[PDB]
Point group: D2
Chain length 494, copies 4
């Protein structure tokens, strides 16, 4: 069930969050935050720079020192505290979802029923792992007792984008904290507000001071002070591919801090003639147009077998005409705006290029209205491999539909790309499903569904979509460091 | 490729194997061993009894004492000794496959190409696991360091049937020895011979005395001495269901020793209309007619969907006439005899119930030849759930073809049984393949194949087909005993 | 930390709990429940026999049918419900502790601070495993995709004693529910009351009907009907070795249900001369005398090195003199009664046997008061291996103190026993700690502490103290059944 | 007993190995290779540059294509190929040890008894892991079947140093090959000859062509072509810290390939007052002076407690005089040369900074012999924290003995460094052993031993000693990439 959004929500939390207290920027500067549906200023937030980052890192190092309350408390206690944070986010679910909507342009129902729900579930999952992270006893050669410890890494920097502020934040801090690390959080400059509200709940939940620090700010300033800091042990980064290159570089030229990258995507989704046609049209559609295309996991190219091609295209055009734009808080609106003017412009350039290079425009292709950064649902057929809308990430409401003839061809083309985050496959045949999913070079493959991400399963990129995994067993374990202890004993019995 | 079999084998090993030496029996009694194809006595073997088992248990307890060679040896050295046993069985492959054919009635091609091949790779799978058995370090509540050790259990008794002497022996002593246990092997009275040759290979490979002891003999004497012994820690039994119930009670009345059981089977096999019919007919045919039906994993209930049913019965009867009985060492022969008269009588008494209860005989139904215990490849149509031939394990070359009309009803009918060792499912629909194999109450389900076991997978019964698993990670780890050590420490840090 | 007990608690729940409803017994019979400190009847409780168990089993079997809410529910959702049960138990903590005190004779501050706390922590641990139980994908030989599933077993009978009612209950239903089983709970006839109150919280928590059924009653009636039932898939039993023999047998002669056993104990405790003496005396004291010795993990035999023997004994006797017996709800009382006349007399026969066989009585050795089943804390010195107090489990406030001289001797002596549940070792030396703890034949070994069980550590017996483990990763996985699925594929790539 | 070295070995293999064929360099240039004990030339070796790397990468890619022999062979068969390579190195043990001594200046007894033994065991361990690398089946939210695959990554560049050619080669090709990757091997320019002989044995074992390619050459040319290649999926580097940063950077600006890093070291070793002093001097001496200081795992800083300091010093000086320098091949020699002139220079630079900074020269401190790159075993006492000899890696026969008094101060001091590969602790106390080893920030901690590396445990850096681990379960799994496959099903039951 879905409540009504808050009518007169007020912004309360705008300061930096360091050592469980609220700080002004060292410089005294603030930066503005805009509603993308109206273009108007919501508020100004304290702007973090290198000198604020230094303060956050000192506090996180102190919280991590041997004998501190966060290091000596039972693993199960780390767990209870993460589970309590989940309880408070659930209690404030209406507030947090109204605020996601205002700041990031998300359809309200989507933000309440999906984003907030996934964020609460990710934290609860992670909470359960805290006392079940285990090492090994090893029957090594020789007269030794040998074992391993999965220890916390230390101080972790968490840097991420604007498209899903609550989910992104949950899936970085959840794994980090349940392994016992302390953290420095740098949310995207476009959408800092829900991150700062979660900070007020971290103090309420009873986290020790310095365990979680949240410093809103820009990229070359705050983001780059974290990646090159000499006393940060790890940075987990989600964002664009070009910036991930700068992060790896920064890490190398400073202290060789561990790096995790989750970067750009152009995700293929393949529909064979033997697929359930209706279900695939619907899933592939939601694949591309969810959050107005503003999603790393969206279906960006649609390979559709020749016999069902014309009929797939026709049904996708019809499905795309069922949208109403406006303020995402208004009931009856299911198409929000793009995040800002820069993004809007990148999307329109690519749309325009598709017309230029001779893809066929089926519907949309233009901006929507006069105010707010709205773009029409846009579908393109007769798309060929070497067009720009086929290669470049659009991050907008733009579907590409292409023809394919045989199986071995469509695998070749779906893999002919420097990206590899996610891929779809639709077929009701057992052997086809298994062998094609194995053959696709992507870290997640969805069979007969799309957007089916869960907390229990690891997700991440092949190739230039990044390295490392988030969530599941495997992803949680990436916030640990392994130590082997090997002790001499006087006699050894098996 | 297939060599020719040995034409005149010297039987060298007929004595009990205890502490790496050969012993006559305490009583002096021997028992005869017969070739099922010719009825001729191959040799007499030394008959072990309670007092011989008593000797064997003392040798295995001595070999398991702390400070002994077998306990102080590096785990990777144990694995190396098991790899060496496999190399020695491989050098003697031709000899062992001939001997298995002569004693067990196994068609030479199956025994050389499948049984010896599987037995070799099984010991090699287990060899690798030895230095990879690992416990845990655990972040327990309180100021403690806690870990587990997966120790060896102790002295293990291993009792098995006659249907596949080399495979059964490998999958029991492989796992048991890789975890560091000592063992008392009790092969079937019908087929003790190959196991005695393996004894001579264990010796030359260099296993410490008393680690492996073999004592051939009868069940109510030597077997019962093992299950009832106050100093045997675990018994692993493969055999009939009624005998498994005796094992369990004797364990309880003596020393509550650990029990693993692998019992009777009546395995269903379900073929839907959208299956590859050529492939499915052939696989179901292999599954029932492999080893003259003398296999626990044999298909015996063929549920076939009504629209392909008549065709499947016609094609199955045609495949069934491509056979040639005779001495299983003869080139060309692909149908052997059954193990002895008591079993030949039991199969004929079930076959006649088939005629009498209304099933229609499509082919066979009678005895073959003059000498030896041969039975004709028999097929029955129109079989229903109430008939004895659909309820009782036949252990013979007798196919039952049953009809089904719906998915829900046939799952129901395959599950309505106290058996559950194995099952098979033939369909090319992804959804049917996954949902039906999840719904079947059996330890192994094979999809679009049959008789497709591997060393790397675990195997065993649901319900009254047994409890416990053999092979794979999980099955290997069932020959360990878990010990927690928890030590006070002065400070704890994550 | 600790409130005042409820002064006049009123018994609310006394009926059988089946299908989320309160049922009268079929026969009409009800059985009495007594307060062990006054010998007065508290109330009568409904008495289940065979026919009531039969209703419990059909309800558990229906809740476990495919398609049912309990089966189709997500695993994270099972977890949620169990964590909610832990919250309601936390909410009713004072109520359940008063009632535990009254029924079982536990000192109230122990019941509140230790038993209720451990009960809440165990459920929360298990809740966390619900969506982290995982099978494997296995690279088998051949063109196959092969995987395992850790399925729930089915209907589980859960039968336990009277010494820690709330801990026993958590540690059975927690692991079983988190795996997705349904259950029949047969609490001890001495102490059915807190179990029945928990049953009231199962409904409030929102478990589907039939997932948890509670049937109070006696052993040979309610218990034997469960263990011998044809539609119960597993029985987990805790209790006397003699009854454990009967359960194992009943399982054999009914349906070979899986059995797990956690039986009698006589736990050795070794104190070397190079230990923290002060702390060893106090730990060993709490080990013996906590819950008036009515605990399977209690220190019975106390081996103490010759050089420090006389001093250890002086300190132990002095430490045993500081007790005030009386009503377990009364402030300043730290010694409750034994549970009933049958146990009081068992313990008095064994105390008298110590006097007769020549051990030196240091303190106590008789009853306290003339109403209630109180026994003076009792200490024997000069105890030898042949005396009955050194061999038999007493389950009462009686400490045995024995001399030893050499390390190799004391190890033999502590391992010379059919029991093997727990052991203790006290030394400051790394090498002694590790080698002696490896050498002791017990399921748990505590080094420089005692009573240090946690929810994340497995626990269970060697030899005739049982088989199977409870809690930790390993114990939780004993409530699953393993299925291998192997599918034929047209091509395989690594 | 130990055999004598081969008397007049002839170098057989000097060319690049690509596609199981021997190639001349594309330019036709070769580079010289020197015996460090005589200064004399051994042979010239083809010098790979960028154009040669491009050929090897091309062959690896071709050998990794889906459908190829190395992709479609069973995992168990990759294991048998790796095990055959090890049997063959065992057979060529005498030849390979001798050649390792000649090229790497390693004492012969060492090269034969330790290095060759370790390299055979490491390969046999990884062989065991091939068909035991196992993904997961996952109970995710929703109506889905979800599982993971641990696939091979693809083309892996392997770059390493000259201090233990066979060990480093085995510890990288073993984990890489056993997960099913193909590889480009880049041996150090100073010690390529053993790599090349191993390339001949790879061919003989029957590996598919292209699976292992070996391109000897210089670092700025062949090494940097590997790390900058657009078609190389992963680079595992072992070497100096300085060069490790360039690899990380070159990977960023090319294709964001996966990077593993094992770098410089300055390993602490703390010896407490209550330690077995005799054992501790021995292990500590061996720790430093093995390989004449040329091991990254060598002890470099010895912290010795005040009560035993002077005795530790004078005992270490006596131990340092048991050395006879010369050609490692002449009987009696147990002290070999450093590798070349530039290393011989760095070491003496630092030894002379020892004299000038304050430290007391107890023995050695200058060069040895007329010819060769020998240095006297050198011990320093009274060493302080700010000295260059206590901060920078010496990689030579130089022991630093420093004094401490407090457990808390020595831990801070041991951890106050940007390095973190290995550490040592010597004590008889249980509590100090566990707590100090838990507090040290290093990847391996050895307690009451040193140089106790084993194949079954993981090893690698904390901080700027690198990231990633090698060997053991966790190390083997670093040469995989996780793919999640989530399929829609029509019904889900637990
Ligand atoms: N579950 C499985 O993996 C599996 C595998 C192969 C065979 N089987 C079963 O084995 C049966 C055929 O073999 P079988 O007839 O030799 O079985 P069986 O019960 O007649 O004898 C099996 C073994 O137990 C011994 N034995 C007999 N009585 C005993 C007693 N009282 N105490 C101790 N040991 C005793 C026998 O001497 C023999 O070694 C079939 O029912 C088949 O399903 C099961």
């Amino acid at each position: 069930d879905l409540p009504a959004p808050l009518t007169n929500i007020k912004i309360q939390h705008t300061k930096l969050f360091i050592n469980n207290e609220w700080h002004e920027s060292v410089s005294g500067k603030t930066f503005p935050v805009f509603n993308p549906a109206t273009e108007e200023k919501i508020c100004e937030v304290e702007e973090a720079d290198k000198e604020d980052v230094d303060k956050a890192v000192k506090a996180a190092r102190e919280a991590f020192q041997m004998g501190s309350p966060w290091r000596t408390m039972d693993a199960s206690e780390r767990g209870q505290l993460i589970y309590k944070l989940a309880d408070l986010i659930e209690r404030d679910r209406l507030l947090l979802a109204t605020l996601e909507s205002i700041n990031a342009g998300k359809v309200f129902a989507s933000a309440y029923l999906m984003d907030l729900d996934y964020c609460i579930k990710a934290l609860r999952y992670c909470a359960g792992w805290a006392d079940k992270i285990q090492g090994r006893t090893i029957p090594v050669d020789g007269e030794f007792f040998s074992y391993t410890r999965h220890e916390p890494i230390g101080v972790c920097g968490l840097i991420f984008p604007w498209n899903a502020p609550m989910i992104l934040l949950a899936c970085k801090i959840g794994p980090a904290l349940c392994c016992g690390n302390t953290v420095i959080v740098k949310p995207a400059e476009q959408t800092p507000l829900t991150a700062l509200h979660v900070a007020s709940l971290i103090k309420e939940a009873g986290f020790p001071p310095g365990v979680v620090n949240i410093v809103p700010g820009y990229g070359p300033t705050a983001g780059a002070a974290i990646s090159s800091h000499m006393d940060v042990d790890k940075v987990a980064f989600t964002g664009s591919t070009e910036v991930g290159k700068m992060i790896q570089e920064a890490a190398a030229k400073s202290n060789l801090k561990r790096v995790t990258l989750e970067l750009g995507a152009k995700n293929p989704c393949i529909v064979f003639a033997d697929a359930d046609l209706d279900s695939a049209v619907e899933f592939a559609h939601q694949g591309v147009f969810t959050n107005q295309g503003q999603s790393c996991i969206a279906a960006s190219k649609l390979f559709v077998e020749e016999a069902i091609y014309d009929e797939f295209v026709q049904r996708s055009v019809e499905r795309a005409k069922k949208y109403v734009f406006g303020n995402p808080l208004t009931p009856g609106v299911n198409h929000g705006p793009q995040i800002n003017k820069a993004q809007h412009n990148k999307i329109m350039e690519l749309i325009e290029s598709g017309k230029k290079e001779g893809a066929k425009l089926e519907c949309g292709g233009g901006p929507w209205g006069n105010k707010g950064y709205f773009i029409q649902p846009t579908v393109f057929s007769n798309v060929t491999d070497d067009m720009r809308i086929a290669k470049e990430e659009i991050f907008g409401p733009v579907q590409q539909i292409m023809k394919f003839k045989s199986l071995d061809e469509v695998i070749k083309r779906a893999n002919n790309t420097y990206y590899g985050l996610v891929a779809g496959v639709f077929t009701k045949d057992l052997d086809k499903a298994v062998t094609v999913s194995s053959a696709l070079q992507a870290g997640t493959v969805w069979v007969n569904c799309y957007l089916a991400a869960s907390a229990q399963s690891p997700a991440g990129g092949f190739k230039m979509s990044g390295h490392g995994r988030e969530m599941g067993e495997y992803g949680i374990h990436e916030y640990t460091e392994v130590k082997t202890v090997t002790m001499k004993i006087s006699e050894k019995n098996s």
